[PDB]
């Protein structure tokens, strides 16, 4: 069962897709602590555009809250609510 060209072109085109991102990427100024899980599932702009001069960028954004465990080594831990930025919609635009 081979994947057909249209179903490749369609499913590979710039669209919001579930993407796992490190917390340390999004919160760099957190050297003291460790977060578990370190990565979280967010909707981000994955894919590729038709032309060289076009780039897949977020058009519409929104925030999402999740329960994350912050651990301070040898000093306990706590489950707390952390906000994160995710993309509801993407589109190919000129690279400028």
């Amino acid at each position, epitope marked *: 069962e081979v994947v*057909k*060209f*249209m179903d490749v*072109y*369609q499913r590979s*085109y710039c*669209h919001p897709i579930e993407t796992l991102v490190d917390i340390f990427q999004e919160y760099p100024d957190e050297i003291e602590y460790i977060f578990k899980p370190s990565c979280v599932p967010l909707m981000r702009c994955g894919g590729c555009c*038709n*032309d060289e*001069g*076009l780039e897949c960028v977020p058009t519409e954004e929104s925030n999402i809250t999740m329960q994350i465990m912050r651990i301070k080594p040898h000093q306990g831990q706590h489950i707390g609510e952390m906000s994160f930025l995710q993309h509801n919609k993407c589109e*190919c635009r*000129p690279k400028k």
Partner: nanobody
Amino acid sequence: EVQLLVSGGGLVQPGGSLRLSCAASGFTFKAYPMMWVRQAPGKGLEWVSEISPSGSYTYYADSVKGRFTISRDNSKNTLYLQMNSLRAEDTAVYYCAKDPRKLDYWGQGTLVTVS
């Protein structure tokens, strides 16, 4: 606010000829590549052709190349498809799209039939 509006299709006998015309609006037509896709009844979607934003590059499917000829006028915001020497296998509904996955737009498709 996108509107891709197609016209030209109908009925013609084998070894015929047709010229389809897509009329785009709602975005910077000049900066995007455009494409043609078709869907035969009972069959899946199929890619037919593409054209670059400048209009200096063209791409065609293996089942049609040599016969069909794509072209665009960026001054008028219109895409064209010169379909020649038609066969029964080409019988399908022809859609013009800037981006796949967006075949919902009104008047975007047109029926081309071979007797």
